Enzyme design. Structure first.
Site, short mmCIF file in Angstrom:
data_model
loop_
_atom_site.label_atom_id
_atom_site.label_comp_id
_atom_site.label_asym_id
_atom_site.label_seq_id
_atom_site.Cartn_x
_atom_site.Cartn_y
_atom_site.Cartn_z
N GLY A 83 35.05 38.46 38.16
CA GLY A 83 34.13 38.60 37.07
C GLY A 83 34.39 38.16 35.86
O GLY A 83 35.47 37.54 35.74
N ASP A 94 43.72 48.59 37.42
CA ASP A 94 43.88 48.45 38.78
C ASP A 94 43.14 47.14 39.33
O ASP A 94 43.85 46.50 40.42
CB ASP A 94 43.09 49.82 39.55
#
Ligand SMILES: Clc1cc(-c2ccncc2)c(-c2ccccc2)nn1
Ligand SMILES: Fc1ccc(-c2n[nH]cc2-c2ccncc2)cc1
Length: 339
Positions: A33, A165
């Site tokens: 992204g 994460d």
């Protein structure tokens, strides 16, 4: 009670976000992204907004989009990236094709820092303490990060740190040797090995094990910590790995005090406990936090664990529309945190 969205195009990507988020400015991009820093009028905060790339492209992407949203909705800890908000411009399940995640803006990563600064022992202690305190929490939910490295550690000007994460030089440099060996039963202590590699690097300014490939990487590891002893050797099922390993010239474990010369001997001691070849013998996050190196930060009544995390979804084999629908549900059931 739906907000008003507005549209805009930045660095080829189209961004459709609520009016509360203003002054979108691109921070970076990748395979998963892109991220923009923005200002959130509703809270007065600077935030980062990530737009997922092709979230429902395949079963793999859909599952992954679900995985990330579930993880980020569950992480509630000062040293772990969590969610201020999650939204989609979609008005219904049918048109749902984009997911946007929002979190506090963190201006830098640990790579931006170690490579443009030499750190004092006090800063090393504070940064590593925070990594461990976040990993304690992560590990307490039966999650293994598996990809700790400097670019996955967001840091602000206050030296406050949060573990990312999911991101967007080489990953293998921070990887535990059991993984360079393809063991299918590695545990949570793969993360401790990575923290050890990170700590080494903040102390010296140099990558501890800068392997060029998977073989070189293992070779550099064994050169520091020695070739496996008999007890570790016994745990390797792979006949190929054993051959490979028993067939190299044997090497002894070096004296960490001589390799990390000048470093605080408490940091050296902790490193030795983290960079143990046998994962069964590596120190855990909770153990490391009680290590004397962190006496000026350790507080056992303030090192929380996580609420249980349901990962049963991980063993499911679903259709894209199912993963998509589950994700839509998670977008809709989101409850932001308090003021
Ligand atoms: Cl590499 C990366 C960085 C960010 C981020 C987080 C905070 N400040 C700056 C960048 C994120 C991210 C994760 C979730 C929501 C928003 C951004 N995701 N991936
Ligand atoms: F050369 C090495 C490097 C690392 C290991 C290792 N450390 N912890 C677990 C293992 C391991 C590796 C492969 N199979 C079982 C266990 C074993 C041999």
């Amino acid at each position: 009670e739906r907000p008003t969205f507005y549209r805009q195009e930045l660095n080829k990507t189209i961004w459709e976000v609520p009016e509360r988020y203003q002054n979108l400015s691109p921070v970076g991009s990748g395979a998963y992204g892109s991220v923009c820093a923005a200002f959130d009028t509703k809270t007065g905060l600077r935030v980062a907004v990530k737009k997922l790339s092709r979230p429902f492209q395949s079963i793999i992407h859909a599952k992954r989009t679900y995985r990330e949203l579930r993880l980020l909705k569950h992480m509630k800890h000062e040293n772990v990236i969590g969610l201020l908000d999650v939204f989609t411009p979609a008005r219904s399940l049918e048109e749902f094709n984009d997911v946007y995640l929002v979190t506090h803006l963190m201006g830098a990563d640990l790579n931006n820092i170690v490579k443009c600064q030499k750190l004092t022992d006090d800063h090393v202690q504070f940064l590593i303490y925070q990594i461990l305190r976040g990993l304690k929490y992560i590990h307490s939910a039966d999650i293994i990060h598996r990809d700790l490295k400097p670019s996955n550690l967001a840091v602000n000007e206050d030296c406050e740190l949060k573990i990312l994460d999911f991101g967007l030089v080489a990953t293998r440099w921070y990887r535990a040797p059991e993984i360079m060996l393809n063991w299918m039963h590695y545990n949570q202590t793969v993360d401790i090995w990575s923290v050890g590699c990170i700590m080494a690097e903040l102390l010296t300014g140099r990558t501890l094990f800068p392997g060029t490939d998977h073989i070189d990487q293992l070779k550099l590891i064994l050169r520091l910590v020695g070739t496996p002893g008999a007890e570790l050797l016994k745990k390797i099922s792979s006949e190929s790995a054993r051959n490979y390993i028993q067939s190299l010239t044997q090497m002894p474990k070096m004296n960490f005090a001589n390799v990390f010369i000048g470093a605080n001997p408490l940091a050296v001691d902790l490193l030795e406990k983290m960079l143990v070849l046998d994962s069964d013998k590596r120190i855990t996050a909770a153990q490391a936090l009680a290590h004397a190196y962190f006496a000026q930060y350790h507080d056992p009544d303030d090192e929380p664990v996580a609420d249980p995390y349901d990962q049963s979804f991980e063993s499911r084999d679903l259709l894209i529309d199912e993963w998509k629908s589950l994700t839509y549900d998670e977008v809709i059931s989101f409850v932001p945190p308090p003021l």
